[PDB]
Design a protein around this nucleic acid. Sequence first.
RNA 1: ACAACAAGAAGACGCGCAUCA
RNA 2: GACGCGCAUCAUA
Lengths: 149, 71, 1168, 105
Amino acid sequence: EYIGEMGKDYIYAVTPLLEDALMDRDLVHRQTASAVVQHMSLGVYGFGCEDSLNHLLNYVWPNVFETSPHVIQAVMGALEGLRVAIGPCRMLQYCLQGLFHPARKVRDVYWKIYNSIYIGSQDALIAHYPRIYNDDKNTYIRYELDYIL
Amino acid sequence: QLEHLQSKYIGTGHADTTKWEWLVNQHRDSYCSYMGHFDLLNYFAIAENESKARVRFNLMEKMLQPCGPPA
Amino acid sequence: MFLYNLTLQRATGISFAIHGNFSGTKQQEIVVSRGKILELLRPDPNTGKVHTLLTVEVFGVIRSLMAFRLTGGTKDYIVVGSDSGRIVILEYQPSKNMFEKIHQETFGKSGCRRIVPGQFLAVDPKGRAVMISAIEKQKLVYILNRDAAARLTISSPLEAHKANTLVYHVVGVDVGFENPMFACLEMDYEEADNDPTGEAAANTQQTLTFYELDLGLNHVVRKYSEPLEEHGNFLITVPGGSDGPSGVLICSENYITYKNFGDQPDIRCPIPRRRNDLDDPERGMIFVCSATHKTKSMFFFLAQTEQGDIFKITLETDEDMVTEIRLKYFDTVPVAAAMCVLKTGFLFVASEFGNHYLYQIAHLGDDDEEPEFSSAMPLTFFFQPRPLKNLVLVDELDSLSPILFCQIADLANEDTPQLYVACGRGPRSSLRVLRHGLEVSEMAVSELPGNPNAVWTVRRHIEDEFDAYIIVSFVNATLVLSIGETVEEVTDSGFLGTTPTLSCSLLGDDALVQVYPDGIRHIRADKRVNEWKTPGKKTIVKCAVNQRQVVIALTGGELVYFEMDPSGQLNEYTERKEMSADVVCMSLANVPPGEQRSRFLAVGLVDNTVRIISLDPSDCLQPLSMQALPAQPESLCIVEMFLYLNIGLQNGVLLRTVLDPVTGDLSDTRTGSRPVKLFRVRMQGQEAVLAMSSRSWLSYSYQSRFHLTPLSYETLEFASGFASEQCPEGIVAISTNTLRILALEKLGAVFNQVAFPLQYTPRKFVIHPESNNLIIIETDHNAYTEATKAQRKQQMAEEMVEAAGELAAEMAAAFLNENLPESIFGAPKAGNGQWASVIRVMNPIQGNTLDLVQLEQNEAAFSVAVCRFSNTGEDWYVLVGVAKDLILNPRSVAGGFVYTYKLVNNGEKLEFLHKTPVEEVPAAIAPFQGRVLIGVGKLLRVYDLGKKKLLRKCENKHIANYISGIQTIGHRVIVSDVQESFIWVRYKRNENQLIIFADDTYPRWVTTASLLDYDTVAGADKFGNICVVRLPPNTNDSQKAEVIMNYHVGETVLSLQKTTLIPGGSESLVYTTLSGGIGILVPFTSHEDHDFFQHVEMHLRSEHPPLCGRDHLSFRSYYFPVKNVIDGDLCEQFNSMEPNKQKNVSEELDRTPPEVSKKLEDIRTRYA
Amino acid sequence: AKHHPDLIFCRKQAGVAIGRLCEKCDGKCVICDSYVRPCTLVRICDECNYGSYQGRCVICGGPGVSDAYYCKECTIQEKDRDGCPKIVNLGSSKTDLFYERKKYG
RNA sequence: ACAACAAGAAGACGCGCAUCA
RNA sequence: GACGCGCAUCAUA
Ligand SMILES: [Zn+2]
Ligand SMILES: [Zn+2]
Ligand SMILES: [Zn+2]
């Protein structure tokens, strides 16, 4: 948090330590690792270092399914910090997996994350929306973007 | 309860949000994005031989109820 | 892997145009708004010309623009509504020549959203309040006042939200010193999304509500709600109070309605239709934009339809009510986005696609022969279009807005490259050629014997506004001439130039000084000869003439000083400076009108050491300073707009040094390898220099900035000024053994253009390798071909004859004989699935057409290629992809065809060979390895030449979406999918199959692509994003590809090409956009320079915020984060920054502004 | 204050007023209670600025001696363009502390 | 009268274990 | 569900 833009050179050093800490061994360690990820992602924004930042998302994402308010708050903060650093496309791709899952709690969690991503940078989601084929009754195809000059 | 940003905002969904509502919301957002930008409007008005005013009027008409009737 | 963004051409697409008294003087000005660039321009009533005076980038999308003034004020404040979540107010300072922010209020998130205000902006005509609104659910009103300090203030916003409302337009209603009123076209949709039966979508009329601002109560409340019978598009404000009734005008389909709150009834008036219209009668008619001329005596309105017809709306009103609406046909102009009716009869037409026009109102159309129209007539009206005869064209601007295809190549015999842009839309489309330099126009041609080497431009008197004499000197003799608009040889000038004259100056009030190697003779207007014989057998070398001093130089490095004494004779000083070198070139500056005389002197030597000599008699002919020079100088000059010293050398280098007793800064650039002479010229009332090289060079000072651009002309040997009745401001430049006259009318900073008219919109074109021709394919939607138009006209004539009015219808012959111009009156737009295609062979050197091929009514061309097959010999083939009955929104294809041509007579004729059917429209055609690969829909096929039809060899079906582009190199082919980014496929020769091995991870709406090298591909995007994709080193020819570059230009890019622009320079990635701008990407040369540029960008991001309060980093990361790209537009704004802030930045960077400017300009000079 | 989940922001249209901070909380961020890199100024709605509420502190409510600021992270996340950060809830902790302080003395 | 203040010490949480019905 | 103990979180005051 303090160094800010100087964290782009030491990001490689703490990656194995964060990888080890993010493992499901204790709640406090995962919360602190999520806070570290959030602060680092916020600091390094604007330099183009998503090659190592994308690796930590694969470990942050499995920690969302938690019930403790502190750990879920930390995970939500980490996800919102990573959203500006990695781009909304990856977050949207992750969220579109179980958005309409038959269960209820997972749907609630995914919809909360989708709303959080939707409130900020709403206009940027136009180009990242997936293509959905129309059914017999309705038309779900956006034909305006298929024009060719 | 610090979820005031989600409830007050328009377009945010929840568990009981159907597919049709999400599709129509994203269609309206796409139409608004098309209208806001100028180069996208130029591309649309060059692809089909029309005018900017005609394209804007057509986009106004298409915003009433896209994706057909609800089920 | 770090790039740098440079910009050559700016966008020329006008979106919003406003007029007012922004400077505060008595002259009107126009503030035009581009997509992201704010520009200010004013017309000149004297010469009828338009010139730009300010151009500042705001780094954001300007969604709205309005102007207003306070109660009793004399200045106009600009209100700008942009894509950011804030509203700003701007003021123009004539002294500073910059835009100054007055206020800044934030009301929501940034970016183009749905419930964020900024789309619609309305202001109170009195100037007491402003309104901003969104598309849905959110409206805001700001109250403006002024304090005792005569400074504009603002209050808290007032909420006017309304759930489930779709606003079409917002406009302010003019009232007389009452509560402000705003009229909007609200529309509800809550019930339309509840009933699934479907009738809720229909019979849902929109209302017209009025909003009242209660100043005493400090809140906004809805007053009325009036449903409309039909759908309207926009509203017009009728002036109220003491000048006209208060109300609004609603424009709709084929109708116009006046409406006012209270007891005022509604008035409905139909829109006139063109006589014998060939368009589909089902098509309607609407208005595009409107203007207003609030004359003190009586006011009217101007409106434009879809076809460009201008009408004149006049309202006749009673004491309180309005009686009828009168319409009158005014003229016809190309379709525009907005009009600005200035004072003194100036009409500005800002076309949406093409050039911009300025019209002078010569007549008001009073008591015209043609009748008018009104709503009182029962029951549909018709009028006959005719030539203008009411407006006179004065000025034309230039705008390359509809850039659709570009191709940089060297087609002419000259070694310099040229740019070929297929711009234009509709019948006004043209193919333009861009060349770097200034516009050269020939004024006169004269052949004279001998070897001319010098000419002179001397006025009769120092106060004369025109030239008097022209002197032409040769190697052996001289040719004295005079100008009288019938230029001939003069004899009574009294010169007797038997010897070649070295100089002809204007020393006295009306006297001349001649220099010859045999002595010095003074030529006074009075018959007096003050001849000074040269002591000894030595001769003269050079001279330094002036308005009060004449400095000569003798052999052996000796200087003789002469001064023009007020008594009337010349005297010589008693000191002669001696040097150890030879005189080569020395120059003297002009006398200042205010001060006594010049003081600094420049002396060149073979030793390459310049010496400054003071002209004061106390210390005359004494050295001051020294400076080393790499090579022997050729010429010297002293330019004055803080003077600068120009150094000319016998080789191709031009050097500039700031005026200073001691040596200082030195900026130089390549000019070459030829002697260079710098001559003074006067452009726009300011001095400038002109040098000679392989190409002519001009260095002028525009807007307190020095430009260095060449001339698009052949070599020359001497230059001088020109002033006469035919051309008050010209240039006399002699040529090889002849006399020629040149002039500069247009500013012509960069990219001179010549337009060759076409008939349709050019989609794509190719270049014939052998004959160096062009094969252009064109296609338009909702268009008719020649045969269809002819048959429709014949059918209309037959119907008119069948009408048989009482036989007595003699108009058929006149209708069939007389036709309107296509390029001025537009084109007949009729149909929904109609198309039109024309294939043309064009010589790029000239404008003539070599061959023309026309297709069927329902055939659309989309691809073209030139290929050679291995089975045949040296045959050249042309393949065209043809569609059949395309419907745009409900997409459906009824087949496709591929045309084959023989190309007989090495590219001067095309003949039909055979056709072949395909199951889907072909989008891309790419030849490789002696065969042709054609993409049919989402399938990839390989074809071969056949006697009957093309024979398919290989087929692939693993492409997910519609193929939009194919690029081939070596043995690998890159497929550009419509929604996915890229696909890599390899072709097997022995086994004959296509296999996919590499793909991309992020979907991208790719429009075009280019291949920088074997493994790097540069893509594009519909929204403006530019990305670079590289394959991982560990790949087997599943395997994803990495991205090494991301950026957001902010404009749609439709072309990419890596090539060299100027000779002797490195390669660059040139891209052209759909708005008219041209930019390049430049890699860095070292790491220290990259670090310095990064530090400058970081400092200016916070220290110099953008004009509209939009974050630069967030704007450039509009869709994807920025990667290894440095924005040059922000870095180049350091020159307009405040001097104290510039200093602070310099000592923050531990450098100096003179060095920073040179460092910034070096990267632009090297690569451009 | 993120520490207390029961606190509720005013969340209304911000006006032209300027927020104030007391001596107890001088450099704290109004959202995340940070201590580094102040970025922008805090604005509050006209409802929070009327009579006895003019010049009061934003978080706790003491006399105003310094202006409120947003940190750089909040500005980057664009959390400032939400509304007035003034806390309208009294808070169950402060009143309870006052209640078991008064009885004891 | 609507009117905010003083340091005998407190606000939200979670993870594990013993006994009983 | 009831009577208890231990550990740990929020730059909590
Ligand atoms: Zn508030
Ligand atoms: Zn406080
Ligand atoms: Zn903060």
